[PDB]
Amino acid sequence: PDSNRLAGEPSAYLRQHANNPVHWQPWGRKALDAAKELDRPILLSIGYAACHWCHVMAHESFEDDDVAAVMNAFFINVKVDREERPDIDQIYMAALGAMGQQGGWPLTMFLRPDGKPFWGGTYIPGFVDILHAVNNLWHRDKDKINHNAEAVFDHLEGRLAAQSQPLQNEISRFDDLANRIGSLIDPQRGGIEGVPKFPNAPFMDTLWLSWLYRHNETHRDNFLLSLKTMLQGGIYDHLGGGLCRYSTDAEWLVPHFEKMLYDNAQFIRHANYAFAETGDDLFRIRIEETVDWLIREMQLPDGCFASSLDADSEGEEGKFYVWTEDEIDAVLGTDAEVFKTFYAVTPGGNWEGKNILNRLHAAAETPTPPPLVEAARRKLLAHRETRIRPGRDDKALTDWNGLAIRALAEAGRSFARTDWLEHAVQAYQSIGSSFQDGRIAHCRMEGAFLYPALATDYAAMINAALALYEATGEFAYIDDARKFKRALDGSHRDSAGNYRLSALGADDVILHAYGDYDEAIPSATSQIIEALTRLFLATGDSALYEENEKLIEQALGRALAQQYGQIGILNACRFAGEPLSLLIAATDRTDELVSIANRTPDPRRLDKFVLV
Amino acid sequence: PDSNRLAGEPSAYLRQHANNPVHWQPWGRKALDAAKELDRPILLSIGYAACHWCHVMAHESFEDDDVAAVMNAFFINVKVDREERPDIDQIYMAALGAMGQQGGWPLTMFLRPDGKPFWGGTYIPRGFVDILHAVNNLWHRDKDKINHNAEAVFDHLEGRLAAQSQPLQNEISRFDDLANRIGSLIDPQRGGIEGVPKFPNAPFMDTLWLSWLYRHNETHRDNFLLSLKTMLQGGIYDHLGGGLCRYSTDAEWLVPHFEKMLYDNAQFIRHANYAFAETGDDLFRIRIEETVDWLIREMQLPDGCFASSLDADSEGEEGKFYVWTEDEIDAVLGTDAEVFKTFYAVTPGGNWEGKNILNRLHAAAETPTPPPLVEAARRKLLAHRETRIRPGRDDKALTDWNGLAIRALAEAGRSFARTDWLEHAVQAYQSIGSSFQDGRIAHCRMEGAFLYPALATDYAAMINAALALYEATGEFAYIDDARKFKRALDGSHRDSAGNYRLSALGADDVILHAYGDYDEAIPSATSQIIEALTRLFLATGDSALYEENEKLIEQALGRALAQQYGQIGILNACRFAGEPLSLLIAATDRTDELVSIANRTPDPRRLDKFVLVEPEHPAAWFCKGHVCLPPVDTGEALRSLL
Ligand SMILES: [Cl-]
């Protein structure tokens, strides 16, 4: 507690806070214990890299030398990344809402030595006023904190780690959910009509699953309009490729220029399924452009994919991705007129006087660029790469890598793109290299691994291993899927058969939550339901089938008690209640039956092959 | 209690002693009661028909009139057939384990009237006449010394044979450690468990193969193959008439014990069927159809079922029936004998006691199928061997062993399209099952002499046999028969704690109801029950069965980790029970090629259920939830379902 130990950590978001004068500590047993022997409170700060206001609180307070000594003598201050320890975030995010104050990131908390919180807040501006007031309260009111900490804690243990009575899996529960999700779709712009606009991968899954199981063409058109209009807006990089996080306005125009790995992997699957229904060439182009961007800018020397790249370059939001007309005319030359007519370039611009490239003005026309404006588009990228390039988060998250490995495996299978498979295998063997002592790591960077993993890490690697089987047909990927299943059971399955996000042997966690709340990615148990359901179709394990039906009813029992974020559970249980299985006997990959199965991607079906 | 009542017993080993001057008594309540009324210790003699040193003690002592008079004077004499009453065998073999003796058969022990033992020895030749008087002194001098150590032995028996600790969770990691240490004991060059003698060790081989299937462990697979291939190429195998002998004296599988057991060949046929399906080595295929020919020709009784064993002593000499000399081979085969002598390593000096034991260890890697001139000499030498004095046969029809043979024939007949093997398996199944009246099957019978009640191994073996015949025929009646066999086991062996006991709960001649947790040459009773109840769950999909099986597994694992040896079968069964595979086949006609693929892909972890709704034809099978439909051969009909 007298030296900043945030150096060498696998999270790049914490590495930037290493030079801070406050002795930052990582979340671990050595941090909580020191708070006991010194009877000093804990000050927890949660944040993620692509958050403009996590850096604001840094330069305003934490990077200031004076206010850090106030923290160094009053608490044991710890910094956590929302994406390195998502278990810690979800615990103390729901802890804030239970105190009667909603908030987001950064999140500043106050913890007694055992970890239970008693006061929190989003961003703290008097900051130092409280920074001492809690220290006063820590000494003046030990009786008040113990009364207040265990009251919020009992609300957490009942909201995040309390099993419910089993609930019967019924079809009408999903059809009801699909009707209400459909009523939130903006009929003209696409997506949830509220602003800001998020891609909302779980919300899309319900509409597509509604279209497949019910042939409800209304939700199918809601899925297609929302996906297609988004991929045409400024939220997508029409020059290099890759989708951004979310949109500021409802027209999908002005975005947050950070590019997350999970959002790109989750739309490749959506666009892949969407191509098989409409044949619209735009879905294929967006997939092909984003995959090239993933290999070029996200893939690490070892093959694994980085987490994300920054939205800020050289100190301004999106300086790297936006153009003015006077510069694109200087580089292109005579071919500059047709380029500006393609991406709605205007002298006045569409964002703060600048021009963000988009294809919303001609979204229904042909998506393929003419040969002159394609060479003009490629020429700008070579000139754009000379700019001050935004920083990258080289942290290799196992759960996020599994999402991408599954995306490249399924899209490469349907489009017969053999190059996409090889890069999926490289990321597979790179992530799978950390599997030692019957366990895998959560994240990794610069040779530093974070153990133990989370339940999402095994579920994602189970789904990626099974996807690699469908594309290849090598049964060694099914054996890998069972190896990940055994590791998941040995560390996350409780006595009731339920799975919990944090490992049961992890000692630095207050609460072993199930992980039932979705975000941009479906929840942990949501992914686990799907992964185990697909693993049954690939093996025929009857004991797995019997334990899955229990797991389904347990999760549905808690999902009924949830107020939000249960969409992934109802989606996975709808698929688990009626899965599709297809065995194909063939003599080679060129067989007709194998081909029409490849050209028919279905998230509800798992393919199996036998030599004949 | 004054005569030899051993005649009429369902055993050939006991009838060999019916004419002994000893007033032998079959094990039962009458012998225990007669021992109490006369204040006399019981002279228990346990053996089996194939044992060589069981016959030498009978020829030295049990047929001697001088020592038969003193056995009838101050002892009540009870002889037990090991294969007829294996529950009694496990009770009093553990008694020697509590006394410090190594153990073995013949087993000669001394029991006080209540049945608890106080002094036990393996083989006591004559002295035998002295040790009888020595024990006879203790019963009239100091009985308290007997009553002290007799209770001390019993407490150790109930603490190891029928002690139930708290249940334990089913873990896969503890199965991998067992497979790792077993493979470390395998002979890297000669195969099998390194050390003499070398036994087939069926439970050990089950672990190595399960480790290969569940872990893709190529090392354990090659250990299973090299051990099986070398054994089937050694002198322990009958290269003329087929069949496997029960163990080998040396480490090269050369010199064997020439007796042939039913459980040995039933167990290796299933192993060889699995080995052929992966390697494609014709040696495994040839050895199977050679031994099945031997089972039908030499072991099958006229009433359908299979005999228990085939003796090793012919005309009083060990293996005289199977062993050849060179000059006789030259006389029978003529000028084409050198082609045969080189194929089976026939030498003028002989490989065992101046004579030749036919084998293939000289070239076990060459082509297994012999050339046509050699097989012609092979068929003719076997027929000439049939003119020899033939070794005797134990016509006793053990239920559990017949169940093992039915399963082997049903699985091999299914993977080789041999319908004649299935009908022979149905003959034994219907014949043995004829004693299943009043919800009670018999443990064994011979010449109209039945033995009741059955043991837990009998129902477990019949369940596995019934479900094996279902996979080969697809008849639902075999499933209900499998249900009938379990519920009879429930009503006669399942205790209040949900566990099963080897002896029936109504049995009166057992001093201790053991669980049957200890393996022998066959997996233990508890193992077969876990396997049968798992395969019954696969064939029926009954959720109530799955729930009571998981808690039966956890209670068996609690006892399995306390015991120090003989738990391999339970660990093998629980690994399969933790990951059992089922295959649903939706066929429009039973000539559907998925039925073919399943037949040529035998897996000891999979059970196939059929639901009716020749060359290789590219097809597709589609299932929507619990709704499976017949296959599809065209490209358009597949687009309709997708
Ligand atoms: Cl045995």
TrEMBL record, chain A:
It comes from Brucella abortus (strain 2308). InterPro entries: 6-hairpin_glycosidase_sf, 6hp_glycosidase-like_sf, Ssp411, Ssp411-like_TRX, Thioredoxin-like_sf. GO terms for biological process: carbohydrate metabolic process. It comes from the Bacteria. CDD domains: SSP411 (cd02955). Residues 4-156 form the Spermatogenesis-associated protein 20-like TRX domain. It holds the Pfam family Thioredox_DsbH. This is Spermatogenesis-associated protein 20-like TRX domain-containing protein.
